[PDB]
Amino acid sequence: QPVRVPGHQTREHRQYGERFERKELRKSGRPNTRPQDAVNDLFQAIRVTDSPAL
RNA sequence: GAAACUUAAAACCGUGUUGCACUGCAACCCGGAAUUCUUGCACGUCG
């Protein structure tokens, strides 16, 4: 569906964003855990170091 | 022959360490395995 923000209050505007990421990025599938746990996040396999000092 | 106590009195007693020498001792790791880890833009809004 084309993304529509449901509602008027800012509390349901908050809870829509923290579930779209948790659906589209928690796709690791560890054997015995909750499927929306932080160890299932796909962005744990990318290591971005700092920049050198300018 | 019938009649008159080999009787009376007298501690099996006195003295004397079941005592002298002798280590419940010698040898022995509270030791071997284990990431304070996983997710997160110092950012948004301008008569």
Side-chain angles (χ1 to χ4, degrees):
Chain A
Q1 48 90 71
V3 167
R4 307 156 301 186
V5 171
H8 318 276
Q9 314 303 305
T10 187
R11 274 80 52 191
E12 61 191 298
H13 297 173
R14 206 269 313 174
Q15 286 201 343
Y16 176 67
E18 58 102 5
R19 294 170 185 167
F20 207 100
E21 312 188 57
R22 213 160 296 168
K23 181 188 59 59
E24 214 67 34
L25 278 171
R26 303 282 170 95
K27 299 175 304 190
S28 298
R30 293 196 174 268
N32 35 323
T33 18
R34 294 155 309 274
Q36 278 73 30
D37 203 80
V39 300
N40 297 288
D41 197 288
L42 282 201
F43 261 81
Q44 73 191 349
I46 296 180
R47 294 97 196 260
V48 185
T49 68
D50 286 7
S51 70
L54 307 179

